[PDB]
Amino acid sequence: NMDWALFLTFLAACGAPATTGALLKPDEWYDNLNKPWWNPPRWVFPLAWTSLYFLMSLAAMRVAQLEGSGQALAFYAAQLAFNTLWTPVFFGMKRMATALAVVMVMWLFVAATMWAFFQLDTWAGVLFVPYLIWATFATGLNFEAMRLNWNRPEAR
Amino acid sequence: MNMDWALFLTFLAACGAPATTGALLKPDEWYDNLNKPWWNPPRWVFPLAWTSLYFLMSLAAMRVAQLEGSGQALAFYAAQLAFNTLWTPVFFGMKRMATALAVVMVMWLFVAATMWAFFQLDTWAGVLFVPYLIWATFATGLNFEAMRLNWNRPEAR
Ligand code: HEM
Ligand SMILES: CCCCCCCC/C=C/CCCCCCCC(=O)OC[C@H](O)CO
Ligand SMILES: CCCCCCCC/C=C\CCCCCCCC(=O)OC[C@H](O)CO
Ligand SMILES: CCCCCCCC/C=C\CCCCCCCC(=O)OC[C@H](O)CO
Ligand SMILES: CCCCCCCC/C=C\CCCCCCCC(=O)OC[C@H](O)CO
């Protein structure tokens, strides 16, 4: 059920958030921050995001072939935009509290996309489960970055 | 084909992400120093124009999302919105004028693709995107002239 035009369009759309990561690698401002005890090493993040961009694009390709896809793809557009927004807010401007709001809104749209995907295609919904899990970890990391660095002005 | 509020509000909420990039822009002395073309509008014009476009593009997507075969058009729509969200941090936040030109040109291509695919399904949704493509052409020209008219420092390799 492989529609390559659809899949490559969704993958190309992931070039926008992928670009935020390439142009805003965490520096020692990030390394100096107090990390939660469960903080993963740096190499985990490019692995996780590359896999998720491929998985969410495959899921979107499947759903976009189905009747009644409209609302699910609207949710998909929404989560992707806030996904693109997060890195410049946290790593570019160091607005940690605003970034927490961003990742929480993204989380809601990721959950809505996954739910809407399950309504139309079980596999597309399953492909989004690791994304919702990873988005949960991202929200916790954003929260812990603020709670463990509250004496920094950029955390408040 | 109706005014579908779940669809429309979802697409409008999605434009909250690029709207946020604009909202977090403090007045910049580097931007005020830049040589601008005579046809550069004052700064207050941009949030007004983008707000109108967010409503226009969201209404267009709402109409298309109700139609069979919308998939490719909606995929184009997701792409244009994502690169739209990318542009402001690249130009104003990181001050990477050349990379921002590439971003806005990619956005332009996906805006053109969305409008074309929208026209294939619904003329009015395509019409609603025409002022967006016009604005995107104007935005690309401003990025091009800003780079052409000023000193540019090297970007980090
Ligand atoms: C919506 C949330 C997030 C998005 C969209 C995102 C995006 C990305 C992407 C795409 C990359 C890969 C860059 C590349 O492959 O060139 C990356 C790397 C990274 N990000 Fe995130 N990220 C998010 C959340 C977070 C959070 C919460 C943290 C930490 C508090 C974080 C810290 C990092 C780190 C440490 C790297 C590794 C950089 C390296 O290569 O050394 N990210 N991010
Ligand atoms: C990681 C940093 C690099 C980021 C990379 C930036 C994004 C690349 C954009 C390429 C142009 C778009 C090409 C993608 C292909 C579009 C799919 C397509 O053309 O669909 C055909 C359809 O039939 C039409 O009606
Ligand atoms: C570059 C500057 C930006 C350009 C901005 C200039 C125009 C904006 C003003 C008014 C638009 C009003 C048009 C509203 C069209 C609504 C269409 C609609 O709601 O129709 C859906 C429903 O299904 C029906 O059947
Ligand atoms: C199925 C149910 C789906 C529910 C969907 C979620 C509900 C979204 C509610 C309201 C969105 C309000 C509009 C979001 C903000 C619009 C973006 C904008 O226009 O920015 C403001 C302006 O530009 C500043 O200058
Ligand atoms: C089913 C899930 C639906 C629930 C999702 C609907 C959320 C509201 C959407 C857009 C509002 C725009 C703000 C969204 C968050 C942007 C980050 C922020 O809050 O910052 C705004 C401020 O303007 C920075 O200066």
From Swiss-Prot, chain B:
The answer to keyword Transcription regulation applying to this record is no
Q: What induces or represses expression of this protein, per its UniProt record?
A: Up-regulated during photosynthetic growth, when compared to aerobic growth in the dark (at protein level).
Known consequence of changing W44F? Increased levels of carotenoids and bacteriochlorophylls
Q: What is its main location?
A: membrane
Q: What is the reported phenotype of gene knockout?
A: No effect on chemoheterotrophic growth, and no defects in the production of photosynthetic pigments. When oxygen levels are reduced during chemoheterotrophic growth, mutant cells respond more rapidly than wild-type and display faster accumulation of carotenoids and bacteriochlorophylls.
* CDD domains xrefs: TSPO_MBR (cd15904)
Has keyword Transmembrane?
Answer: yes
Q: Tell me the Gene Ontology biological-process terms attached to this UniProt entry.
A: tetrapyrrole metabolic process
Tell me where it resides.
Membrane; Cell inner membrane
Residues spanning the membrane: 5-25, 44-65, 73-93, 97-119, 124-144
Mutating W38C: effect? Decreases growth rate 2-3 fold. Leads to increased levels of the protein and decreased levels of carotenoids and bacteriochlorophylls
Question: What subunit structure does UniProt give?
Answer: Homodimer.
Membership in a protein family: Belongs to the TspO/BZRP family.
Specify the protein name. Answer: Tryptophan-rich sensory protein
Q: Which gene encodes it?
A: tspO
